[PDB]
Amino acid sequence: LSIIKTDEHYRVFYGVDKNFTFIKIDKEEANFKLAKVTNKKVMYENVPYIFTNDGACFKYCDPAININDTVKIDLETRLVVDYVSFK
Amino acid sequence: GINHRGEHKRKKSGGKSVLHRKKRNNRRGSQMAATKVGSTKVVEKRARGGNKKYKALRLNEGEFLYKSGNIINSSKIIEVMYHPTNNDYVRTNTITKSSVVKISSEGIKIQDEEDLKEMYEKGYLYAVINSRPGQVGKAEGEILQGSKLEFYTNLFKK
Amino acid sequence: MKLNIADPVNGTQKMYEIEHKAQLKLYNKKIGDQFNGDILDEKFNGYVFEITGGDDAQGFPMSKKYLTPNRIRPLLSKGDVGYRCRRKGVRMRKSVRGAIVSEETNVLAIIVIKKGDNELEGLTDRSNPRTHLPKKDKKLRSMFNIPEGEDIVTYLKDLPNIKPTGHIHERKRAQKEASKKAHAERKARNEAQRQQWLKTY
RNA sequence: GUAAUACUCACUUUAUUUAAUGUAUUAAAGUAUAACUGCGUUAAAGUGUAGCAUAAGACUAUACAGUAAGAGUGAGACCUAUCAGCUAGUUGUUAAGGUAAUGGCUUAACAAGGCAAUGACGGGUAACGGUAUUACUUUGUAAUAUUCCGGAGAAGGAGCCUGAGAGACGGCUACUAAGUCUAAGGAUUGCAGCAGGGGCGAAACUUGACCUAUGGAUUUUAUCUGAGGCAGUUAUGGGAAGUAA
Ligand SMILES: [Mg+2]
Ligand SMILES: [Mg+2]
Ligand SMILES: [Mg+2]
Ligand SMILES: [Mg+2]
Ligand SMILES: [Mg+2]
Ligand SMILES: [Mg+2]
Ligand SMILES: [Mg+2]
Ligand SMILES: [Mg+2]
Ligand SMILES: [Mg+2]
Numbered sequence: 001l002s003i004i005k006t007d008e009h010y011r012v013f014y015g016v017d018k019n020f021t022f023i024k025i026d027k028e029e030a031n032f033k034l035a036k037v038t039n040k041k042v043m044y045e046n047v048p049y050i051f052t053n054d055g056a057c058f059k060y061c062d063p064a065i066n067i068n069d070t071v072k073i074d075l076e077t078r079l080v081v082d083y084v085s086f087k
Numbered sequence: 088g089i090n091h092r093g094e095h096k097r098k099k100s101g102g103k104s105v106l107h108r109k110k111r112n113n114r115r116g117s118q119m120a121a122t123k124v125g126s127t128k129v130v131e132k133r134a135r136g137g138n139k140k141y142k143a144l145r146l147n148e149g150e151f152l153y154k155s156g157n158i159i160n161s162s163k164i165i166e167v168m169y170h171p172t173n174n175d176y177v178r179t180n181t182i183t184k185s186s187v188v189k190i191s192s193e194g195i196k197i198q199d200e201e202d203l204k205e206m207y208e209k210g211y212l213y214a215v216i217n218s219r220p221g222q223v224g225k226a227e228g229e230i231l232q233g234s235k236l237e238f239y240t241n242l243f244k245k
Numbered sequence: 246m247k248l249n250i251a252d253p254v255n256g257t258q259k260m261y262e263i264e265h266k267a268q269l270k271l272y273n274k275k276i277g278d279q280f281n282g283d284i285l286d287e288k289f290n291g292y293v294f295e296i297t298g299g300d301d302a303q304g305f306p307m308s309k310k311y312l313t314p315n316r317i318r319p320l321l322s323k324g325d326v327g328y329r330c331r332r333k334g335v336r337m338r339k340s341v342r343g344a345i346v347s348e349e350t351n352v353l354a355i356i357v358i359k360k361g362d363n364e365l366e367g368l369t370d371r372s373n374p375r376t377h378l379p380k381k382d383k384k385l386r387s388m389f390n391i392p393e394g395e396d397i398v399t400y401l402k403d404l405p406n407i408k409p410t411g412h413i414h415e416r417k418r419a420q421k422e423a424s425k426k427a428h429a430e431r432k433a434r435n436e437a438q439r440q441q442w443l444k445t446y
Numbered sequence: 447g448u449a450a451u452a453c454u455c456a457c458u459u460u461a462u463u464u465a466a467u468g469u470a471u472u473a474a475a476g477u478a479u480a481a482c483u484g485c486g487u488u489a490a491a492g493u494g495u496a497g498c499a500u501a502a503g504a505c506u507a508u509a510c511a512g513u514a515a516g517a518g519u520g521a522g523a524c525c526u527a528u529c530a531g532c533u534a535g536u537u538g539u540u541a542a543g544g545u546a547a548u549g550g551c552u553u554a555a556c557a558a559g560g561c562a563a564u565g566a567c568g569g570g571u572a573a574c575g576g577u578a579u580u581a582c583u584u585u586g587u588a589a590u591a592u593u594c595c596g597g598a599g600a601a602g603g604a605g606c607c608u609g610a611g612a613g614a615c616g617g618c619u620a621c622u623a624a625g626u627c628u629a630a631g632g633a634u635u636g637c638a639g640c641a642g643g644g645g646c647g648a649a650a651c652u653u654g655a656c657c658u659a660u661g662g663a664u665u666u667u668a669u670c671u672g673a674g675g676c677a678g679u680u681a682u683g684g685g686a687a688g689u690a691a
């Protein structure tokens with residue numbers, strides 16, 4: 001989340017004692033976003049698809065991305081940019 | 088009106104049962120719609136959360152499939168020959184699932200087989216329904232060929 | 246009974262009173278049947294009249310489709326004669342009157358079909374002017390033949406102001422074409438990705 | 447009211463439905479009734495006939511997440527032998543109808559199965575189940591209307607419309623028990639919602655002010671809110687203290 005005024009950006013994940021925290025980050029980290037694949041199948045008219053945790057659908061990605069690997073969402077063009085495999 | 092609950096029946100041991108709540112709307116039933124033969128007629132239903140159902144009161148010109156040549160063509164419906172559970176439906180002419188009938192062979196183009204040839208001189212052929220008429224709203228089925236014809240014809244009226 | 250009459254071509258309605266010996270002539274007549282006005286009075290010669298409604302002595306209205314002389318209590322719903330609804334799908338019982346006319350009818354609603362010999366001084370003489378105009382521009386342009394589509398302006402040039410509705414239906418018709426512009430370019434973008442996606446693989 | 451079908455815990459639902467939410471795919475001239483104007487009706491409660499009357503409106507389909515709910519399997523739970531045999535849609539097979547869905551859930555045909563001293567079948571309860579929380583303790587007992595989660599009912603019974611979701615009761619229909627208004631033709635009511643009165647008893651409070659704070663009603667900064675706060679009456683209990691040095 002961010003404010004358009006004052007250029008303040010935060011990433012939301014848990015602290016250490018099971019509580020919500022907000023950590024100020026940089027504008028180079030303010031672009032992208034991380035998520036994790038849960039399911040993948042081919043839809044109508046022979047188009048591949050990859051389903052993430054939040055419910056976004058993505059097509060025509062790299063075939064080296066498997067069911068459990070994580071992705072990197074650009075958040076502005078809504079395109080899969082980078083992935084990290086699971087090992 | 089008609090419920091499908093299970094709270095009224097006896098136990099496994101045979102003792103009586105007791106109720107504690109009134110009738111719910113979740114388990115709700117309807118009466119039997121017997122599909123006859125005549126001029127065509129379709130009414131609509133309303134089910135839980137939209138999802139419209141179609142019921143057919145009087146049905147005519149059902150669709151059937153030829154198994155050997157693999158084409159589909161329409162025919163008329165004349166008579167019913169056999170019904171499995173209740174044998175009174177044959178005198179009232181009601182069409183349900185898996186009940187064999189007698190159809191016109193006008194538009195059908197048959198191959199030359201030994202068994203179908205003698206009925207093909209007349210107008211009639213045989214078919215068996217495979218769809219739920221009261222809930223889908225239209226009949227579809229297969230044409231009897233081969234040893235499947237040998238099984239049903241022992242059960243005919245004679 | 247006192248009769249209520251109205252003029253459809255003039256827009257005037259009035260009430261009148263009958264002698265008792267003409268009241269027995271009107272017995273056993275279904276709502277919706279015409280009759281000649283000679284049997285009612287000498288003043289009403291040459292008049293054609295038709296019954297369309299009436300009330301009871303206790304105020305209960307008469308229905309059209311029940312075909313009985315006496316009172317009935319059916320389960321009315323929305324839109325029938327006798328029940329004005331305030332919720333949705335909520336139907337209840339009331340009390341109405343049947344169609345055929347007997348001695349318990351109190352008033353009668355009578356339409357005028359054909360004018361007789363003599364003119365009525367309050368009913369047939371004066372005309373009452375109309376009050377409202379259509380808002381739709383297509384039937385507004387047919388009555389006033391103006392081609393340049395200045396509906397309020399040429400009416401001001403004709404000069405009771407009328408507000409047309411051509412602006413409202415133009416607004417959603419513009420928004421309906423707004424979707425087709427943005428939707429079509431979406432189909433170009435995925436296809437440029439698709440042909441690019443199959444170049445590597 | 448219900449001794450378990452309700453509740454708690456561990457599993458299944460490829461056997462199922464979901465308005466408002468998120469990300470995506472697809473498609474795109476003609477036709478009523480109100481408010482208005484004008485004639486009326488009845489003790490009341492409500493209702494009628496006209497002006498070719500006259501407005502806005504109505505005549506895309508699916509996926510996957512996400513919330514919500516339905517349906518199953520197994521195990522646990524008070525007293526009684528002056529309650530020892532019980533069960534006939536009861537147990538099973540085939541087939542069909544119906545439901546959003548599995549299933550004797552209902553109906554034809556056939557067969558004789560199913561449960562019990564490890565307590566079946568009966569009878570009683572001055573019996574809503576767990577839980578936060580109190581006591582007393584050497585492997586644990588007893589209370590738990592009271593905080594919170596879950597289930598059932600709106601005088602007693604039954605039936606149904608609208609709707610994504612009601613067998614709804616500050617929604618409708620009928621019967622039974624109690625009534626109230628009237629010009630005698632008819633019309634009408636459900637305080638186990640907040641105050642308050644009557645009866646019953648040994649036994650339990652103001653016919654009070656208000657959207658300040660926490661929330662709900664499809665964006666809730668000004669609309670509504672007897673939900674919820676703020677004050678008055680009472681030896682219901684627990685604290686920090688007085689009546690001297
Ligand atoms: Mg009108
Ligand atoms: Mg039977
Ligand atoms: Mg308890
Ligand atoms: Mg009471
Ligand atoms: Mg309620
Ligand atoms: Mg209820
Ligand atoms: Mg009820
Ligand atoms: Mg009440
Ligand atoms: Mg009270």
Ligand SMILES: [Mg+2]
Nearest residue numbers: 649650680682
């Ligand atoms: Mg007391």
